[PDB]
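Re-running the complex after MR caught last week's input typo. The corrected sequence lines follow. Everything else is unchanged.
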Amino acid sequence: DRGIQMLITTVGAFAAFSLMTIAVGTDYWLYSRGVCREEVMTHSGLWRTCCLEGAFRGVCKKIDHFPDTAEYLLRAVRASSVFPILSVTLLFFGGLCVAASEFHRSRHSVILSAGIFFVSAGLSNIIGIIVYISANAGSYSYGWSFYFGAFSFIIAEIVGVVAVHIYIEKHQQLRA
Amino acid sequence: VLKLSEQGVLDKLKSKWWYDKGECGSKDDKTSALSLSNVAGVFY
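Corrected-run output:
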């Protein structure tokens, strides 16, 4: 099933990267009641907050991420969205390795490295989610951008597993 | 004074000069479920 395995890997890598990039771009992480500048229903993301109703509806303002070392570091890390961006980077590199595999069948470690990138992307994603949620804590709901990030994590981990299976089976078959 | 009170003018004045010119701009329950912030270290 190597053809199907590679198909799953490529489709999944693209899906994870697309979902994660959209999530980092779009502004439907959180539904709360803040202000785009009275408090009304809004819809914030990682960078901008926007009004969901009333006169200033459609108006968005840059999130004042800033207004205790730990509080400072959390605020810093959440302000820059280090971890969502790092997960996007690693998904990109994983996709590059998956693409490069076919054009260079000589070296095995390419697809292995793809797998490892994907796994690491998932871990960065988790850290991101935790930092985001924790920084918010310092009524509400989560939007579809948040869930895009979550589904990116799941798919990334699946693709990592499949990639490592491909590498394992190549070394198992060729060695014996 | 009574007419002003019944027309809401005194209420409005109080609102304006206490709240609408308020520095804080705050005008306002606890579920008690542990929040992710209470266990974030263990995830890290």
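None of the earlier attempt is carried over here. DSSP finds three helices and no strands in chain B. The interface with chain A takes residues 35-37, 40, 43-44 of chain B (CB under 8 Å).
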